Amino acid sequence: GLQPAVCLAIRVNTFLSCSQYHKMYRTVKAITGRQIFQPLHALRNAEKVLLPGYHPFEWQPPLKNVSSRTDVGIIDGLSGLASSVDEYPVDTIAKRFRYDSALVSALMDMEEDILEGMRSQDLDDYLNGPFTVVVKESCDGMGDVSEKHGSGPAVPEKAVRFSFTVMRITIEHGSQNVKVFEEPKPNSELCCKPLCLMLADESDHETLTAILSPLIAEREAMKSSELTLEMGGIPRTFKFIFRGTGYDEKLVREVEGLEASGSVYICTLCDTTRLEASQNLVFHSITRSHAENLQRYEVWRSNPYHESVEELRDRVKGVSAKPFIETVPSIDALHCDIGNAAEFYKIFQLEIGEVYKHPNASKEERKRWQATLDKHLRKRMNLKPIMRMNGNFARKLMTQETVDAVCELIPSEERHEALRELMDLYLKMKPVWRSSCPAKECPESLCQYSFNSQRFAELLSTKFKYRYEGKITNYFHKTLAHVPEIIERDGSIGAWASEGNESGNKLFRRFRKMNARQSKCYEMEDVLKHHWLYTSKYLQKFMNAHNA
């Protein structure tokens, strides 16, 4: 005999579809003669407890503009958007949970973990003290999502996903707050719970705003409120702190009202021009926020001081749009690594062509330089050339062996020394904005970070001025300037990266292909439900039943 919950856990964790599981169950029953696996209807009955809209809960004070019903599941992401022929065209299929139901479902899944942490922290396991749940929000935009035939809108070939992850829960027990749950693998796809799936372009601001306005409305509603929920007997109270740091640079620019990527104003944390960043390179402070962006947009619209276009753009630094999502200013570790890799790749191409003494080169010779670099990299580091830049290429490129292999193509030796020093400094600085707990994992590296940043900036301005003189890269600026301050503010950079959402995109593609109905009006619902079930600690605990 085997329980329906365990059968469901096996099915959802070993990438099994309902049809394949039906085949397995039928064959096992026919041969053994005894019903070992539970049938499909039993599994789908057992899956209702895990999904949202099952457990009662209360909000005090009640959420503004949010329904008080506690039995809402998968709802339309358009949120009543008008589809009449007279109004603006709508070509988008969106499905979402409710933000106040997804949270209670996640907490009820983590009930056992919360109780275990309470017991292991020497606290009594009946306290109803107000917990503080920190939740990290990620929004990602996938391309090359093929559309389907059939009735429905002319939906584009792109998708947008909005997800959240519970990071930390703390309880106040006197003069100090003590932890009862900390996520061990924050960047894993196992803990990244989907909240909204839509098929629309990331650059389509009207559609993106129309779909994501209800979610932001709910989130702002439950910032000042307390949630009462019965968790294993006693009812307990929860608060929430939302930290949206899983966004990429382009999406932060779009949703915080800042201008497009190519502009004089480069950093999304401070307000410094590219030339000023190239001249300073080290000393900057974080002076940007959602409220400041709103005020600056108001200044831009009103033009109270009667300034020309250029003077107004200087006054309101890059805020030519009105923000609509509050994001914490931080650095995405994955994209920072990729950008640094691309910059170093271009540095190698320039160095194997001796641009430091030949300022001008033909367009047909830089291609030859790139071809030589690609051939030698394949020969030595076993890396094939790729079109864009991904993380694995960055990890295999930012090693010292790559520099040693590349130096065979550089005629000079002082260039060898300069490039080796640059790579050593970069590798010394990297584990600070990539580890999950720098104070307990790389303390010497964290302490010796300002010195290494200054040395890196000096080397960049002295021995690489042919590319960095009046122009610096956004990621280089962020890495050299804001990393110690962000570490001091938060605790870790890298535990708040977009890695979880990027990993979940793979699950999204796999589920849309072989775990969801192929109709145009059910695929998003099926994918959302299956993804939520996959990211469930109650089910994942059974797969670790061998060791206990």
């Binding site: 503009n65 009543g80 958007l81 007279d86 409710r98 601001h205 009207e206 033009n303």
Partner: protein
């Protein structure tokens, strides 16, 4: 009525349904682009230039006293007489309505370069709620000018708005608003002859009358064939407003109105049912007191225009309509519409 195909340059992506076109001394300008203004054209107002059946959109700069308006997607626009434009309502790219009146004028004009002045005027009194799809016209009586504003769509009030139906819309009340631009005041009037709200209608401004024809009511999901005449009298005392329902209206939603000659107008396009598209044109002639509408010759629409599900357009102010049609080829392509020009 002749139909020609217009090719558009490198900023096609800036044209979206619900844009507005303005006419200043024979020069055509464009407002209401898709997305927030970029670095190339911070103002968002372009110079709509058509020559040898080719369309170009070049940027236009505002003045130092100006206010940089958001791209409004379904505003109410009227001409006020130097010649200035009044835009009220609309929908910003963040999908939130606006309740601000903006007045556009021409500050300095150079050789093929025009600088605008956009002044924001704040209303006081019984101010209309934020809305889109409504209509505003200007009436002259006894040497004094005022503005008449009718109803449209709006979101539910903040006390009855739920996230699960966040984007739902309802027709505003059928109240008639008189707006004094000189002092920036507004007064609301309830007329018993108007009982159902209207949106996406057509308004024609005579000397002291406003004719409201066409429309769509969300309460009953019908397109009534009703014509209303609103007369405003402005004596030394309080203003007086009267409404009279006249026979002879037509059922059309989101029509395009143009002025061919004096005391003559042409209504082209719109919608009759959800899946039925109005392919006939109407001619409206106004007299001292009585007006009459009739059916004129149907222009030779092409094959693509007839079978398009949706179509949008605007008026170019010289008896010409600029109207688009979706191409349904947005996948890895730059051309998403098949704009046409129609001459009356």
């Amino acid at each position: 009525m002749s139909l020609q195909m217009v090719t558009v340059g490198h900023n096609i992506a800036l044209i979206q349904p619900g844009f507005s076109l303005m006419n200043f001394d024979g020069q055509v300008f464009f407002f209401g682009q898709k997305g927030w203004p970029k670095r190339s054209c911070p103002t968002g107002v372009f110079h709509f230039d058509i020559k040898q059946n080719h369309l170009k959109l070049k940027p236009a700069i505002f003045s130092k006293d100006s206010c940089y308006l958001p791209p409004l997607r379904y505003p109410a626009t009227c001409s006020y007489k130097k010649h200035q434009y009044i835009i009220h309502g609309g929908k910003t790219p963040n999908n939130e309505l606006s309740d601000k009146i903006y007045i556009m004028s021409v500050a300095c004009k150079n050789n093929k370069k025009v600088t605008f002045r956009c002044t924001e005027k704040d209303l006081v009194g019984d101010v209309p709620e934020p809305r889109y799809g409504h209509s505003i016209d200007v009436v002259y009586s006894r040497g004094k000018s005022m503005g008449v504003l009718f109803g449209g769509r709006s979101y539910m009030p903040s006390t009855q708005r739920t996230t699960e139906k966040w984007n739902s819309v309802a027709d505003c009340l059928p109240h008639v608003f008189l707006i004094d631009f000189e002092f920036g005041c507004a007064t609301s009037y309830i007329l018993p002859e108007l009982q159902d709200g209207l949106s996406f209608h057509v308004s024609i401004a005579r000397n002291d009358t406003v004719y409201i024809l066409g429309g769509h009511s969300l309460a009953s999901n019908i397109r009534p064939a009703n014509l209303y005449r609103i007369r405003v009298d402005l004596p030394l005392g309080t203003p007086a407003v009267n409404c009279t329902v006249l026979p002879g209206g037509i059922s059309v939603s989101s029509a395009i109105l143009t002025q061919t000659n004096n005391d003559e107008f042409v209504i082209v396009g719109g919608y009759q049912l959800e899946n039925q598209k109005r392919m006939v044109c109407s001619l409206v002639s106004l007299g001292d007191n009585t007006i009459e509408i009739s059916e004129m010759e149907t222009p030779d629409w092409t094959s693509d225009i007839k079978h398009s599900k949706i179509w949008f357009g605007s008026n170019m102010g010289n008896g010409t309509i600029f109207l688009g049609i979706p191409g349904d080829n947005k996948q890895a392509m730059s051309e998403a519409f098949y704009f046409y020009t129609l001459r009356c």
